[PDB]
Write a protein that binds this ligand. Sequence first.
Ligand code: HEM
Length: 116
Amino acid sequence: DAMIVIDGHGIIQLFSTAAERLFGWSELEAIGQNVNILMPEPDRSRHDSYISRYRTTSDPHIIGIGRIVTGKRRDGTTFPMHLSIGEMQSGGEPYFTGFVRDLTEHQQTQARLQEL
Ligand code: HEM
């Protein structure tokens, strides 16, 4: 589907093959980058605080809720995707995993039916 693992600072730790196809970064390019490289403004500039905020408050806004958001490709094109976040820990540090479902086709079908 598309899978991404980040550390508690938002740095990409793992980047699945499907993720590469979906976003247009290669694994090496992507690893060691902030996850925000995947989103547009204003979310890009806020994502760190989203993360900071959750770590302190421990109130989920998307964790085990899911949400549809706009994702951003390497070539600058944006698209809708469903996102679910999981919390994990390893070596005492927290890790987040995101499962992505590309909603591009659903949106286009819907737009196209509306337009007709
Ligand atoms: C690529 C496009 C993404 C966008 C546009 C996005 C957007 C957001 C937004 C809007 C929030 C805050 C929700 C709120 O305050 O109401 C948030 C929180 C968060 N995001 Fe993302 N996200 C993206 C990808 C990811 C990925 C791939 C991960 C992890 C692998 C991730 C990890 C988190 C975490 C850990 C939080 C705080 C958790 C929570 O509040 O439940 N994000 N993100």
